[PDB]
Amino acid sequence: TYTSLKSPENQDYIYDLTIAHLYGNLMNTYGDNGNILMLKYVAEKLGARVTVDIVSINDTFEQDDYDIVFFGGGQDYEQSIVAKDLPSKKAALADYIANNKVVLAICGGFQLLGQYYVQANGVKIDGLGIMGHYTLNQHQNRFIGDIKIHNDEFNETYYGFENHQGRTFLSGDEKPLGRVVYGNGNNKEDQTEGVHYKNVYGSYFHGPILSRNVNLAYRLVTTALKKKYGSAISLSSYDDILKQEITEEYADLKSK
Amino acid sequence: MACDKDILKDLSKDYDIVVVTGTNGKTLTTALTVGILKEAFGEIITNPSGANMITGITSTFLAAKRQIAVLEIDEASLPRITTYLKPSLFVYTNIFRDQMDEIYTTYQMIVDGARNAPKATILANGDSPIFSSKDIVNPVQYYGFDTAKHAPQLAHYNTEGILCPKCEHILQYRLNTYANLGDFVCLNCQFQRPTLDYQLTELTAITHQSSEFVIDGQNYKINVGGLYNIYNALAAVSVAEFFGVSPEKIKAGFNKSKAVFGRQETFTIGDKSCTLILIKNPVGASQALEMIQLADYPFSLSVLLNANYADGIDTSWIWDANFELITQMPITEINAGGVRHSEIARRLRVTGFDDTKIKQAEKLEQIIETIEKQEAKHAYILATYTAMLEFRSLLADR
Ligand SMILES: Nc1ncnc2c1ncn2[C@@H]1O[C@H](COP(=O)(O)OP(=O)(O)NP(=O)(O)O)[C@@H](O)[C@H]1O
Ligand SMILES: [Mg+2]
Ligand SMILES: [Zn+2]
């Protein structure tokens, strides 16, 4: 374990957030590690000092040490090696999730929170098995293109780019991150994309998702701060810290 | 011509053939190698820039009439072309992911190609862990950087290809140049960089526009910045040394041929001295930033991001580039430009650089006007391919 990123030491902050960048040096593809930079940016605006630790193969994970876990995507080989290390973090990650602590998981990281995923060529790779979703393969086909989803619990729209062979199916105890307006999403049979379970947020969205969707970036960080310091604290509003990003945000009027 | 295979079997018989292959630096390494060997051995047969497939190679032998050929060969073509050619020497520059894309597949292609001439020597970049990943039949010599070592450290977490090919643990580095290159060492098993046959033993003076270095007891200077030109120089010098060319002939050949590296692209906008640099991928952009970080003057930084066909539609790669370097640079002000002026400005704000000193411009023309009116004498412009063409085009109209 080492610290990859740290807020400047000479600035004052009333809060402290520690981020576990889970396998951040192996699951590091498609700009999805940009999500770390967006969490740090939004956390600093809310008065939090940020520490990011790379917690990778053979590193101990203590759930009490972290406020946000980010688990991104990687190449098939790196993902198969990460899968061999997962059992070593299962107990601590299950406890983290059971305590309603914040996880953002993208692509392979989303698949590996669940039961298993299957590569295009039929090889089944076991996941942490902490959540009930599972991922089937596609022999030849991939889901590729722009996607838009809407979460009805929060009334929030998210935009991104999907590129996955995986077909994810959610278990009965999960919710989707959102319902598809346009695009494939998890499996092209139901209208689901990603997962929302307690304070686990999973997606197939490249972007990175938090660069394209500061609504979700704000949600993850405020949620983490209120879990750490309690729900009675008063944080700066969405509109006050992210006015420029809200003004410039890509959004369209397509329906479904 | 399907019969290009018959011309090669025929015409290539009467040459001592050197093949240069790898992901990057194939053209520049070939050109400098030709320049140096010419000094020792006279006329050298070589292919035009990038004409590195069966057609380009065949045409090269067709223009010629106990002689040396140095050919750039496309990785994918090598297994086929070496069932027709029998090279005496293979040079492996490096192996990196195709960005569009499995490194061991492109690697297996060049291993198969050399395997077809099992007596030919391979001169490989010892700094690439891929080039020590496999039992190889050919004899192998290694070139690399043998400068001061530090204790083992992890490469930056966005680096690709850092798994030990023997034990699947994460490699560390006693020296890291760029990407996964350097004095790699596994802390779990015996795997580590092999003893180098050809050693860059000192970096003497590295600037934003030049580099001086010692290879096997001789000094070299090039008039362009950036580590990748030092590797291309190291590779070409290593070939000349393998061919037994004298130190005095390598120096004379090097100095006459090093103009093949080109120069940084400099012009003026009013009284400002400007440098324009193409960015297209994370490692490249990170290396541009490390180079301009060395500048001994204050400068403006303009970053122009387009997403056209020729740039690539995908801009997610900017998030993997080490733009965090801008907080450790003498930058006076930042211009965010191109069609994606908004996304690149967000990418620069997220570094923690003062956002009052980052200004979007909807039109490249406004970037030029901003640079003309700026206080600092120097300006750096980092641009994607189409942003660079539009920028050069607007400069031409003055
Ligand atoms: N040794 C190197 N390591 C990494 N990148 C390099 C290296 N040398 C050159 N490059 C980059 O690759 C570009 C092309 O240089 P070149 O010598 O033509 O490479 P190549 O292997 O011929 N590939 P390409 O022409 O792009 O198909 C340069 O402009 C640099 O951006
Ligand atoms: Mg080339
Ligand atoms: Zn090892």
PDB file of all heavy atoms in Angstrom, chain A residues 2 24-25 28 30-31 33 37 41 58 77 84 211 244-245 248, chain B residues 97 154 157-159 168-169 316 319-320 324 342 346 349-350 360:
ATOM      1  N   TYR A   2       0.600   2.184  -0.890  1.00  0.00           N
ATOM      2  CA  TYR A   2       1.260   3.504  -0.851  1.00  0.00           C
ATOM      3  C   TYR A   2       0.224   4.571  -1.174  1.00  0.00           C
ATOM      4  O   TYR A   2      -0.829   4.231  -1.769  1.00  0.00           O
ATOM      5  CB  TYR A   2       2.438   3.509  -1.825  1.00  0.00           C
ATOM      6  CG  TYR A   2       2.079   3.574  -3.289  1.00  0.00           C
ATOM      7  CD1 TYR A   2       2.136   4.780  -3.979  1.00  0.00           C
ATOM      8  CD2 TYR A   2       1.751   2.436  -4.003  1.00  0.00           C
ATOM      9  CE1 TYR A   2       1.875   4.850  -5.334  1.00  0.00           C
ATOM     10  CE2 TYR A   2       1.489   2.491  -5.369  1.00  0.00           C
ATOM     11  CZ  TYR A   2       1.553   3.698  -6.040  1.00  0.00           C
ATOM     12  OH  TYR A   2       1.292   3.768  -7.391  1.00  0.00           O
ATOM     13  N   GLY A  24      -5.534  -0.217  -8.367  1.00  0.00           N
ATOM     14  CA  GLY A  24      -5.463   0.989  -9.216  1.00  0.00           C
ATOM     15  C   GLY A  24      -4.322   0.935 -10.222  1.00  0.00           C
ATOM     16  O   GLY A  24      -4.452   1.575 -11.288  1.00  0.00           O
ATOM     17  N   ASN A  25      -3.303   0.103  -9.967  1.00  0.00           N
ATOM     18  CA  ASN A  25      -2.118  -0.083 -10.856  1.00  0.00           C
ATOM     19  C   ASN A  25      -2.303  -1.287 -11.808  1.00  0.00           C
ATOM     20  O   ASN A  25      -1.368  -1.542 -12.572  1.00  0.00           O
ATOM     21  CB  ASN A  25      -0.826  -0.143 -10.032  1.00  0.00           C
ATOM     22  CG  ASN A  25      -0.837  -1.194  -8.941  1.00  0.00           C
ATOM     23  OD1 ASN A  25      -1.769  -1.995  -8.857  1.00  0.00           O
ATOM     24  ND2 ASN A  25       0.169  -1.177  -8.083  1.00  0.00           N
ATOM     25  N   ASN A  28      -6.664  -0.139 -14.829  1.00  0.00           N
ATOM     26  CA  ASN A  28      -6.217   1.257 -15.028  1.00  0.00           C
ATOM     27  C   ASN A  28      -6.480   1.672 -16.473  1.00  0.00           C
ATOM     28  O   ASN A  28      -5.782   2.574 -16.956  1.00  0.00           O
ATOM     29  CB  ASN A  28      -4.749   1.416 -14.611  1.00  0.00           C
ATOM     30  CG  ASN A  28      -3.791   0.546 -15.403  1.00  0.00           C
ATOM     31  OD1 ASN A  28      -4.222  -0.186 -16.302  1.00  0.00           O
ATOM     32  ND2 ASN A  28      -2.505   0.594 -15.041  1.00  0.00           N
ATOM     33  N   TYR A  30      -8.873   2.829 -20.103  1.00  0.00           N
ATOM     34  CA  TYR A  30     -10.036   3.601 -20.623  1.00  0.00           C
ATOM     35  C   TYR A  30     -10.299   4.889 -19.837  1.00  0.00           C
ATOM     36  O   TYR A  30     -11.319   5.505 -20.168  1.00  0.00           O
ATOM     37  CB  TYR A  30     -11.267   2.697 -20.716  1.00  0.00           C
ATOM     38  CG  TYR A  30     -11.866   2.561 -22.093  1.00  0.00           C
ATOM     39  CD1 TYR A  30     -11.949   1.326 -22.712  1.00  0.00           C
ATOM     40  CD2 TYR A  30     -12.365   3.659 -22.771  1.00  0.00           C
ATOM     41  CE1 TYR A  30     -12.509   1.185 -23.970  1.00  0.00           C
ATOM     42  CE2 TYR A  30     -12.928   3.537 -24.030  1.00  0.00           C
ATOM     43  CZ  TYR A  30     -12.999   2.294 -24.633  1.00  0.00           C
ATOM     44  OH  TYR A  30     -13.548   2.160 -25.875  1.00  0.00           O
ATOM     45  N   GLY A  31      -9.246   5.491 -19.288  1.00  0.00           N
ATOM     46  CA  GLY A  31      -9.411   6.768 -18.572  1.00  0.00           C
ATOM     47  C   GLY A  31     -10.270   6.630 -17.328  1.00  0.00           C
ATOM     48  O   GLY A  31     -10.570   7.663 -16.722  1.00  0.00           O
ATOM     49  N   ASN A  33      -9.519   5.631 -14.473  1.00  0.00           N
ATOM     50  CA  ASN A  33      -8.770   6.151 -13.286  1.00  0.00           C
ATOM     51  C   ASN A  33      -8.981   7.673 -13.131  1.00  0.00           C
ATOM     52  O   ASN A  33      -8.746   8.198 -12.040  1.00  0.00           O
ATOM     53  CB  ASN A  33      -7.315   5.692 -13.342  1.00  0.00           C
ATOM     54  CG  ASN A  33      -7.107   4.306 -12.747  1.00  0.00           C
ATOM     55  OD1 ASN A  33      -8.052   3.681 -12.263  1.00  0.00           O
ATOM     56  ND2 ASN A  33      -5.870   3.812 -12.751  1.00  0.00           N
ATOM     57  N   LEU A  37      -9.519  11.386  -9.834  1.00  0.00           N
ATOM     58  CA  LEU A  37      -9.154  12.813  -9.927  1.00  0.00           C
ATOM     59  C   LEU A  37     -10.433  13.626  -9.700  1.00  0.00           C
ATOM     60  O   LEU A  37     -10.361  14.609  -8.999  1.00  0.00           O
ATOM     61  CB  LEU A  37      -8.473  13.078 -11.272  1.00  0.00           C
ATOM     62  CG  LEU A  37      -7.297  12.155 -11.620  1.00  0.00           C
ATOM     63  CD1 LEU A  37      -6.694  12.519 -12.980  1.00  0.00           C
ATOM     64  CD2 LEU A  37      -6.206  12.178 -10.545  1.00  0.00           C
ATOM     65  N   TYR A  41     -11.071  16.257  -6.604  1.00  0.00           N
ATOM     66  CA  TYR A  41     -11.491  17.629  -6.983  1.00  0.00           C
ATOM     67  C   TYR A  41     -12.752  18.033  -6.224  1.00  0.00           C
ATOM     68  O   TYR A  41     -12.790  19.116  -5.601  1.00  0.00           O
ATOM     69  CB  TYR A  41     -11.717  17.676  -8.486  1.00  0.00           C
ATOM     70  CG  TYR A  41     -12.159  18.984  -9.093  1.00  0.00           C
ATOM     71  CD1 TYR A  41     -11.330  20.102  -9.156  1.00  0.00           C
ATOM     72  CD2 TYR A  41     -13.398  19.070  -9.715  1.00  0.00           C
ATOM     73  CE1 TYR A  41     -11.733  21.261  -9.817  1.00  0.00           C
ATOM     74  CE2 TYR A  41     -13.811  20.218 -10.376  1.00  0.00           C
ATOM     75  CZ  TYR A  41     -12.973  21.310 -10.441  1.00  0.00           C
ATOM     76  OH  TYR A  41     -13.445  22.407 -11.094  1.00  0.00           O
ATOM     77  N   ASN A  58      -1.873  -8.466  -2.843  1.00  0.00           N
ATOM     78  CA  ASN A  58      -1.026  -8.770  -1.657  1.00  0.00           C
ATOM     79  C   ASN A  58      -1.039  -7.613  -0.657  1.00  0.00           C
ATOM     80  O   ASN A  58      -0.253  -7.690   0.274  1.00  0.00           O
ATOM     81  CB  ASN A  58       0.409  -9.135  -2.056  1.00  0.00           C
ATOM     82  CG  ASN A  58       0.454 -10.360  -2.947  1.00  0.00           C
ATOM     83  OD1 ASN A  58       1.080 -10.352  -4.005  1.00  0.00           O
ATOM     84  ND2 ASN A  58      -0.257 -11.394  -2.544  1.00  0.00           N
ATOM     85  N   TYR A  77      -6.299 -10.027 -19.057  1.00  0.00           N
ATOM     86  CA  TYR A  77      -5.197 -10.695 -18.318  1.00  0.00           C
ATOM     87  C   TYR A  77      -5.096 -10.084 -16.901  1.00  0.00           C
ATOM     88  O   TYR A  77      -5.158 -10.815 -15.865  1.00  0.00           O
ATOM     89  CB  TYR A  77      -3.890 -10.658 -19.129  1.00  0.00           C
ATOM     90  CG  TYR A  77      -2.726 -11.273 -18.387  1.00  0.00           C
ATOM     91  CD1 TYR A  77      -2.776 -12.601 -17.989  1.00  0.00           C
ATOM     92  CD2 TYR A  77      -1.595 -10.544 -18.052  1.00  0.00           C
ATOM     93  CE1 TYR A  77      -1.743 -13.182 -17.272  1.00  0.00           C
ATOM     94  CE2 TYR A  77      -0.531 -11.125 -17.374  1.00  0.00           C
ATOM     95  CZ  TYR A  77      -0.610 -12.447 -16.984  1.00  0.00           C
ATOM     96  OH  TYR A  77       0.396 -13.044 -16.290  1.00  0.00           O
ATOM     97  N   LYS A  84      -7.478 -13.527  -8.728  1.00  0.00           N
ATOM     98  CA  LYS A  84      -6.820 -14.554  -7.865  1.00  0.00           C
ATOM     99  C   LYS A  84      -6.592 -14.002  -6.457  1.00  0.00           C
ATOM    100  O   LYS A  84      -6.544 -14.806  -5.507  1.00  0.00           O
ATOM    101  CB  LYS A  84      -5.497 -15.025  -8.466  1.00  0.00           C
ATOM    102  CG  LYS A  84      -5.630 -15.790  -9.778  1.00  0.00           C
ATOM    103  CD  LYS A  84      -4.293 -16.221 -10.327  1.00  0.00           C
ATOM    104  CE  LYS A  84      -4.377 -16.825 -11.711  1.00  0.00           C
ATOM    105  NZ  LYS A  84      -3.027 -16.913 -12.306  1.00  0.00           N
ATOM    106  N   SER A 211     -16.496  12.576 -14.627  1.00  0.00           N
ATOM    107  CA  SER A 211     -16.149  13.748 -15.457  1.00  0.00           C
ATOM    108  C   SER A 211     -17.390  14.199 -16.234  1.00  0.00           C
ATOM    109  O   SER A 211     -17.640  15.399 -16.327  1.00  0.00           O
ATOM    110  CB  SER A 211     -15.026  13.438 -16.386  1.00  0.00           C
ATOM    111  OG  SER A 211     -14.866  14.502 -17.304  1.00  0.00           O
ATOM    112  N   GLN A 244     -19.853  25.878 -12.727  1.00  0.00           N
ATOM    113  CA  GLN A 244     -19.281  25.895 -14.093  1.00  0.00           C
ATOM    114  C   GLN A 244     -19.525  24.553 -14.816  1.00  0.00           C
ATOM    115  O   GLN A 244     -19.932  24.559 -16.012  1.00  0.00           O
ATOM    116  CB  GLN A 244     -17.788  26.181 -14.046  1.00  0.00           C
ATOM    117  CG  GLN A 244     -17.232  26.243 -15.453  1.00  0.00           C
ATOM    118  CD  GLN A 244     -15.778  26.613 -15.408  1.00  0.00           C
ATOM    119  OE1 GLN A 244     -15.197  26.756 -14.337  1.00  0.00           O
ATOM    120  NE2 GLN A 244     -15.186  26.709 -16.581  1.00  0.00           N
ATOM    121  N   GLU A 245     -19.255  23.438 -14.147  1.00  0.00           N
ATOM    122  CA  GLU A 245     -19.432  22.078 -14.716  1.00  0.00           C
ATOM    123  C   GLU A 245     -20.915  21.873 -15.023  1.00  0.00           C
ATOM    124  O   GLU A 245     -21.219  21.386 -16.115  1.00  0.00           O
ATOM    125  CB  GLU A 245     -18.901  21.032 -13.728  1.00  0.00           C
ATOM    126  CG  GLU A 245     -17.382  21.026 -13.597  1.00  0.00           C
ATOM    127  CD  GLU A 245     -16.715  22.046 -12.682  1.00  0.00           C
ATOM    128  OE1 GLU A 245     -17.431  22.758 -11.922  1.00  0.00           O
ATOM    129  OE2 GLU A 245     -15.452  22.156 -12.762  1.00  0.00           O
ATOM    130  N   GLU A 248     -21.783  23.823 -18.234  1.00  0.00           N
ATOM    131  CA  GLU A 248     -21.142  23.286 -19.461  1.00  0.00           C
ATOM    132  C   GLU A 248     -21.597  21.840 -19.731  1.00  0.00           C
ATOM    133  O   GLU A 248     -21.434  21.437 -20.856  1.00  0.00           O
ATOM    134  CB  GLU A 248     -19.619  23.422 -19.341  1.00  0.00           C
ATOM    135  CG  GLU A 248     -19.168  24.875 -19.202  1.00  0.00           C
ATOM    136  CD  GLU A 248     -17.665  25.030 -19.080  1.00  0.00           C
ATOM    137  OE1 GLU A 248     -16.978  24.022 -19.273  1.00  0.00           O
ATOM    138  OE2 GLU A 248     -17.197  26.143 -18.781  1.00  0.00           O
TER     139      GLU A 248
ATOM    140  N   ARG B  97       1.139  -1.528 -25.968  1.00  0.00           N
ATOM    141  CA  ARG B  97      -0.212  -1.889 -26.478  1.00  0.00           C
ATOM    142  C   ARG B  97      -0.587  -0.980 -27.654  1.00  0.00           C
ATOM    143  O   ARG B  97      -0.211   0.206 -27.619  1.00  0.00           O
ATOM    144  CB  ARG B  97      -1.251  -1.838 -25.355  1.00  0.00           C
ATOM    145  CG  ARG B  97      -2.657  -2.217 -25.791  1.00  0.00           C
ATOM    146  CD  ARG B  97      -3.633  -2.222 -24.631  1.00  0.00           C
ATOM    147  NE  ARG B  97      -3.828  -0.900 -24.057  1.00  0.00           N
ATOM    148  CZ  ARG B  97      -4.664   0.015 -24.536  1.00  0.00           C
ATOM    149  NH1 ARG B  97      -5.386  -0.249 -25.612  1.00  0.00           N
ATOM    150  NH2 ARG B  97      -4.770   1.189 -23.943  1.00  0.00           N
ATOM    151  N   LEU B 154       7.575   1.298  -7.356  1.00  0.00           N
ATOM    152  CA  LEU B 154       6.514   1.079  -8.366  1.00  0.00           C
ATOM    153  C   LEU B 154       6.553   2.194  -9.404  1.00  0.00           C
ATOM    154  O   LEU B 154       6.786   3.332  -9.047  1.00  0.00           O
ATOM    155  CB  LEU B 154       5.155   1.022  -7.674  1.00  0.00           C
ATOM    156  CG  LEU B 154       5.012  -0.142  -6.707  1.00  0.00           C
ATOM    157  CD1 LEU B 154       3.882   0.116  -5.735  1.00  0.00           C
ATOM    158  CD2 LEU B 154       4.780  -1.432  -7.464  1.00  0.00           C
ATOM    159  N   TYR B 157       0.934   4.363 -11.285  1.00  0.00           N
ATOM    160  CA  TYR B 157      -0.203   3.406 -11.312  1.00  0.00           C
ATOM    161  C   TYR B 157      -0.923   3.338 -12.678  1.00  0.00           C
ATOM    162  O   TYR B 157      -1.615   2.342 -12.944  1.00  0.00           O
ATOM    163  CB  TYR B 157      -1.160   3.761 -10.178  1.00  0.00           C
ATOM    164  CG  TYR B 157      -1.849   5.094 -10.316  1.00  0.00           C
ATOM    165  CD1 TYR B 157      -3.023   5.235 -11.048  1.00  0.00           C
ATOM    166  CD2 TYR B 157      -1.375   6.202  -9.638  1.00  0.00           C
ATOM    167  CE1 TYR B 157      -3.682   6.457 -11.116  1.00  0.00           C
ATOM    168  CE2 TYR B 157      -1.982   7.437  -9.755  1.00  0.00           C
ATOM    169  CZ  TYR B 157      -3.171   7.555 -10.447  1.00  0.00           C
ATOM    170  OH  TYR B 157      -3.738   8.798 -10.549  1.00  0.00           O
ATOM    171  N   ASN B 158      -0.795   4.330 -13.560  1.00  0.00           N
ATOM    172  CA  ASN B 158      -1.403   4.241 -14.913  1.00  0.00           C
ATOM    173  C   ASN B 158      -0.466   3.539 -15.907  1.00  0.00           C
ATOM    174  O   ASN B 158      -0.859   3.356 -17.056  1.00  0.00           O
ATOM    175  CB  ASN B 158      -1.824   5.604 -15.457  1.00  0.00           C
ATOM    176  CG  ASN B 158      -3.107   6.116 -14.830  1.00  0.00           C
ATOM    177  OD1 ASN B 158      -3.965   5.334 -14.413  1.00  0.00           O
ATOM    178  ND2 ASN B 158      -3.227   7.433 -14.750  1.00  0.00           N
ATOM    179  N   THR B 159       0.694   3.073 -15.494  1.00  0.00           N
ATOM    180  CA  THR B 159       1.610   2.356 -16.419  1.00  0.00           C
ATOM    181  C   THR B 159       1.042   0.966 -16.745  1.00  0.00           C
ATOM    182  O   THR B 159       0.602   0.265 -15.802  1.00  0.00           O
ATOM    183  CB  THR B 159       3.004   2.185 -15.822  1.00  0.00           C
ATOM    184  OG1 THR B 159       3.418   3.433 -15.271  1.00  0.00           O
ATOM    185  CG2 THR B 159       4.016   1.687 -16.832  1.00  0.00           C
ATOM    186  N   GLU B 168       3.691 -13.343 -11.844  1.00  0.00           N
ATOM    187  CA  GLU B 168       2.424 -12.550 -11.876  1.00  0.00           C
ATOM    188  C   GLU B 168       2.297 -11.611 -10.661  1.00  0.00           C
ATOM    189  O   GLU B 168       1.170 -11.134 -10.336  1.00  0.00           O
ATOM    190  CB  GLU B 168       1.259 -13.518 -12.060  1.00  0.00           C
ATOM    191  CG  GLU B 168       1.336 -14.169 -13.433  1.00  0.00           C
ATOM    192  CD  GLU B 168       0.383 -15.327 -13.723  1.00  0.00           C
ATOM    193  OE1 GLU B 168      -0.241 -15.841 -12.743  1.00  0.00           O
ATOM    194  OE2 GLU B 168       0.232 -15.679 -14.954  1.00  0.00           O
ATOM    195  N   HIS B 169       3.422 -11.263 -10.047  1.00  0.00           N
ATOM    196  CA  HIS B 169       3.481 -10.162  -9.060  1.00  0.00           C
ATOM    197  C   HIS B 169       3.809  -8.865  -9.825  1.00  0.00           C
ATOM    198  O   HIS B 169       4.138  -8.917 -11.020  1.00  0.00           O
ATOM    199  CB  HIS B 169       4.428 -10.509  -7.912  1.00  0.00           C
ATOM    200  CG  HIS B 169       3.934 -11.545  -6.964  1.00  0.00           C
ATOM    201  ND1 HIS B 169       3.465 -12.789  -7.391  1.00  0.00           N
ATOM    202  CD2 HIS B 169       3.847 -11.526  -5.611  1.00  0.00           C
ATOM    203  CE1 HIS B 169       3.062 -13.466  -6.333  1.00  0.00           C
ATOM    204  NE2 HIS B 169       3.295 -12.717  -5.220  1.00  0.00           N
ATOM    205  N   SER B 316     -11.102  10.208 -23.743  1.00  0.00           N
ATOM    206  CA  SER B 316     -10.983   9.644 -22.375  1.00  0.00           C
ATOM    207  C   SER B 316      -9.506   9.471 -22.007  1.00  0.00           C
ATOM    208  O   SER B 316      -9.195   9.517 -20.796  1.00  0.00           O
ATOM    209  CB  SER B 316     -11.749   8.354 -22.233  1.00  0.00           C
ATOM    210  OG  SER B 316     -11.118   7.318 -22.971  1.00  0.00           O
ATOM    211  N   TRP B 319      -7.450  11.653 -19.541  1.00  0.00           N
ATOM    212  CA  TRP B 319      -7.595  11.372 -18.094  1.00  0.00           C
ATOM    213  C   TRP B 319      -6.456  10.473 -17.611  1.00  0.00           C
ATOM    214  O   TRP B 319      -6.177  10.486 -16.397  1.00  0.00           O
ATOM    215  CB  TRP B 319      -8.991  10.813 -17.814  1.00  0.00           C
ATOM    216  CG  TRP B 319      -9.971  11.901 -18.059  1.00  0.00           C
ATOM    217  CD1 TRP B 319     -10.591  12.204 -19.235  1.00  0.00           C
ATOM    218  CD2 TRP B 319     -10.301  12.950 -17.139  1.00  0.00           C
ATOM    219  NE1 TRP B 319     -11.316  13.352 -19.096  1.00  0.00           N
ATOM    220  CE2 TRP B 319     -11.183  13.815 -17.811  1.00  0.00           C
ATOM    221  CE3 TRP B 319     -10.023  13.180 -15.787  1.00  0.00           C
ATOM    222  CZ2 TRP B 319     -11.764  14.917 -17.186  1.00  0.00           C
ATOM    223  CZ3 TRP B 319     -10.600  14.269 -15.167  1.00  0.00           C
ATOM    224  CH2 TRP B 319     -11.455  15.125 -15.862  1.00  0.00           C
ATOM    225  N   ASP B 320      -5.776   9.771 -18.519  1.00  0.00           N
ATOM    226  CA  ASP B 320      -4.637   8.886 -18.160  1.00  0.00           C
ATOM    227  C   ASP B 320      -3.308   9.640 -18.309  1.00  0.00           C
ATOM    228  O   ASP B 320      -2.333   9.199 -17.703  1.00  0.00           O
ATOM    229  CB  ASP B 320      -4.684   7.582 -18.960  1.00  0.00           C
ATOM    230  CG  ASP B 320      -5.778   6.644 -18.488  1.00  0.00           C
ATOM    231  OD1 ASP B 320      -6.322   6.882 -17.375  1.00  0.00           O
ATOM    232  OD2 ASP B 320      -6.099   5.689 -19.235  1.00  0.00           O
ATOM    233  N   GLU B 324      -1.260  16.369 -14.142  1.00  0.00           N
ATOM    234  CA  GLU B 324      -0.933  16.796 -12.748  1.00  0.00           C
ATOM    235  C   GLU B 324       0.462  17.428 -12.723  1.00  0.00           C
ATOM    236  O   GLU B 324       0.723  18.263 -11.828  1.00  0.00           O
ATOM    237  CB  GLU B 324      -1.049  15.634 -11.757  1.00  0.00           C
ATOM    238  CG  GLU B 324      -2.493  15.314 -11.383  1.00  0.00           C
ATOM    239  CD  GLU B 324      -3.455  14.965 -12.516  1.00  0.00           C
ATOM    240  OE1 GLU B 324      -3.029  14.254 -13.492  1.00  0.00           O
ATOM    241  OE2 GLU B 324      -4.646  15.415 -12.427  1.00  0.00           O
ATOM    242  N   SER B 342     -14.031  22.616 -23.347  1.00  0.00           N
ATOM    243  CA  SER B 342     -14.710  22.419 -22.047  1.00  0.00           C
ATOM    244  C   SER B 342     -14.103  21.220 -21.292  1.00  0.00           C
ATOM    245  O   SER B 342     -13.767  21.365 -20.088  1.00  0.00           O
ATOM    246  CB  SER B 342     -16.188  22.266 -22.271  1.00  0.00           C
ATOM    247  OG  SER B 342     -16.844  22.089 -21.039  1.00  0.00           O
ATOM    248  N   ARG B 346     -11.765  21.283 -17.894  1.00  0.00           N
ATOM    249  CA  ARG B 346     -12.130  20.471 -16.702  1.00  0.00           C
ATOM    250  C   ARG B 346     -10.937  19.562 -16.304  1.00  0.00           C
ATOM    251  O   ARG B 346     -10.587  19.492 -15.111  1.00  0.00           O
ATOM    252  CB  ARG B 346     -13.428  19.714 -16.995  1.00  0.00           C
ATOM    253  CG  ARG B 346     -13.882  18.848 -15.834  1.00  0.00           C
ATOM    254  CD  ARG B 346     -15.299  18.354 -15.988  1.00  0.00           C
ATOM    255  NE  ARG B 346     -15.459  17.479 -17.126  1.00  0.00           N
ATOM    256  CZ  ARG B 346     -16.019  17.799 -18.289  1.00  0.00           C
ATOM    257  NH1 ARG B 346     -16.455  19.016 -18.522  1.00  0.00           N
ATOM    258  NH2 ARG B 346     -16.121  16.882 -19.233  1.00  0.00           N
ATOM    259  N   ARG B 349      -8.389  21.870 -14.578  1.00  0.00           N
ATOM    260  CA  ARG B 349      -8.870  22.335 -13.248  1.00  0.00           C
ATOM    261  C   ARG B 349      -8.643  21.226 -12.222  1.00  0.00           C
ATOM    262  O   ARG B 349      -8.196  21.533 -11.094  1.00  0.00           O
ATOM    263  CB  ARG B 349     -10.344  22.757 -13.315  1.00  0.00           C
ATOM    264  CG  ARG B 349     -10.549  24.074 -14.057  1.00  0.00           C
ATOM    265  CD  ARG B 349     -11.887  24.734 -13.772  1.00  0.00           C
ATOM    266  NE  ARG B 349     -12.998  23.833 -14.000  1.00  0.00           N
ATOM    267  CZ  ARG B 349     -13.564  23.586 -15.186  1.00  0.00           C
ATOM    268  NH1 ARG B 349     -13.097  24.138 -16.287  1.00  0.00           N
ATOM    269  NH2 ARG B 349     -14.590  22.753 -15.272  1.00  0.00           N
ATOM    270  N   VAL B 350      -8.868  19.975 -12.626  1.00  0.00           N
ATOM    271  CA  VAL B 350      -8.908  18.810 -11.695  1.00  0.00           C
ATOM    272  C   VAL B 350      -7.490  18.512 -11.173  1.00  0.00           C
ATOM    273  O   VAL B 350      -7.358  17.918 -10.102  1.00  0.00           O
ATOM    274  CB  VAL B 350      -9.559  17.624 -12.422  1.00  0.00           C
ATOM    275  CG1 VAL B 350      -9.102  16.313 -11.865  1.00  0.00           C
ATOM    276  CG2 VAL B 350     -11.075  17.728 -12.400  1.00  0.00           C
ATOM    277  N   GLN B 360     -10.856  29.190 -21.303  1.00  0.00           N
ATOM    278  CA  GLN B 360     -11.358  28.530 -22.524  1.00  0.00           C
ATOM    279  C   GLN B 360     -11.426  29.544 -23.656  1.00  0.00           C
ATOM    280  O   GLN B 360     -11.780  30.698 -23.400  1.00  0.00           O
ATOM    281  CB  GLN B 360     -12.739  27.930 -22.262  1.00  0.00           C
ATOM    282  CG  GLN B 360     -12.662  26.767 -21.291  1.00  0.00           C
ATOM    283  CD  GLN B 360     -14.037  26.210 -21.094  1.00  0.00           C
ATOM    284  OE1 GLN B 360     -14.687  25.820 -22.066  1.00  0.00           O
ATOM    285  NE2 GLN B 360     -14.462  26.172 -19.847  1.00  0.00           N
TER     286      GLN B 360
END
